[PDB]
Amino acid sequence: AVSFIGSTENDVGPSQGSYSSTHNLPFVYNTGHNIGYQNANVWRISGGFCVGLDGKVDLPVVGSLDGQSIYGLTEEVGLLIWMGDTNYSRGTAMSGNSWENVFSGWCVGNYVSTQGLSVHVRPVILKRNSSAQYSVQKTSIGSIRMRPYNGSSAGSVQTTVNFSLNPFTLND
């Protein structure tokens, strides 16, 4: 069986967070996973349910850096994005605007457990300005959906949750 136990709208990163550069364009801010969201318990699963995760970014793709997409927020600011299973360290680098397999999946046994997820992003400066500061308002990022497999089914259970980037300021 499966049921939804998480939240549908999720904020990524602390509200009105401020980040400073520590070091060429596009320039990527080394924010680790400070700008993220994670929840180990989004779906409750049991009885042999097999589930993985698909992730999708809705922001426009405005470039490619080191193998993954640069998603645009404004003409001067973009994002590198990772989506995946619960632990931030297992995030899958996102490219494109299609649903992508971000967690290969697992199968619970004949007991009850949960399926979680995580998302984190890193700011990218696409074009510099005279103020050496870049701010972005709250913006929808994309979604993550559970992907049942091996015959498992979502039935009438909610499959998708969404993510919105909390407003932030980048200081250089």
Ligand SMILES: CC(=O)N[C@@H]1[C@@H](O)[C@H](O)[C@@H](CO)O[C@H]1O
């Ligand atoms: C309470 C708990 O730990 N659930 C982790 C869950 O968050 C994760 O999505 C899944 C697959 O790695 O394995 C579960 O054991």
